[PDB]
């Protein structure tokens, strides 16, 4: 086509979605990770995670307001990944890399899994 | 912080939101523009438009499944802008620039209004 493109549009949209998340506006699901609860937008979770994409396209699960993750999932790892989904920034640290990679594999977040594997390979 | 950032994340999220729109997955509102209807995600509309942000943060309107736009709004102008919201690409043409700018002013999409004013000023 003969379209023009606004370079910062996608980043501005995500920044606004994160602002809605921070003010708990139009969040439509709670993700339960052991004793912790995380409110989010189903659409953002699906856009970032192969697991959430599969969950919310299921004709029964699409209507659930609460999703319980596997008990092996670390709440901090999930929190770091939820922040990444809404910001593009990943808080990857020596102390959390194993939990973050395990959570990203479970959530099916291929690019996160890739950088974790590379950071781990560098430290061995 | 000491975060790393994935450059393409925001663009990939928006691409996936557009894929959900195309398959009508988790769309939660109909925007009525005269005889035409456009299905969308409230969160994406709020992230792109000052008007939708104001509408869906209203304690009564946040719960509406149908929003009727002012009858002066052109359905093609709205369609072009809805496509822009989900893709960052604006199909701006000599034949549609006036309708697109009028629709972007009504929707409160400042960057779109800005490029329309510049393209119009160049042709005078």
């Amino acid at each position: 086509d003969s379209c023009i493109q606004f370079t910062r549009h996608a980043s501005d949209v995500l920044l606004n979605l994160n602002r809605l998340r921070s003010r708990d506006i139009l969040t439509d699901v709670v993700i339960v990770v052991s004793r912790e609860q995380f409110r989010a937008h189903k659409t953002v979770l699906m856009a970032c995670s192969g697991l959430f994409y599969s969950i919310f396209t299921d004709q029964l699960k699409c209507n659930l307001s609460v999703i319980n993750l596997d008990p092996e999932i670390n709440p901090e790892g999930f929190c770091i990944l939820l922040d990444f989904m809404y910001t593009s920034r990943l808080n990857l640290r020596e102390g959390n890399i194993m939990a973050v990679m395990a959570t990203a594999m479970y959530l099916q977040m291929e690019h996160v899994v890739d950088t974790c594997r590379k950071f781990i390979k560098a430290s061995e | 912080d000491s975060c790393i950032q994935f450059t393409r994340h925001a663009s990939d999220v928006l691409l996936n939101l557009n894929r959900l729109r195309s398959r009508d997955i988790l769309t939660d509102v109909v925007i009525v523009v005269s005889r035409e209807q456009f299905r969308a995600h409230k969160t994406v509309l709020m992230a792109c438009s000052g008007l939708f942000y104001s509408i869906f943060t209203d304690q009564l309107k946040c719960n509406l499944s149908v929003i009727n736009l002012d009858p002066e709004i052109n359905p093609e102008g709205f369609c072009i802008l809805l496509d822009f919201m989900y893709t960052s690409r604006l199909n701006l043409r000599e034949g549609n620039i006036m309708a697109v700018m009028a629709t972007a002013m009504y929707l409160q999409m400042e960057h779109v209004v800005d490029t329309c004013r510049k393209f119009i000023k160049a042709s005078e």
Partner: peptide, 4 residues
């Protein structure tokens, strides 16, 4: 704005 750019030509994509």
């Amino acid at each position: 704005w750019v030509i994509p």
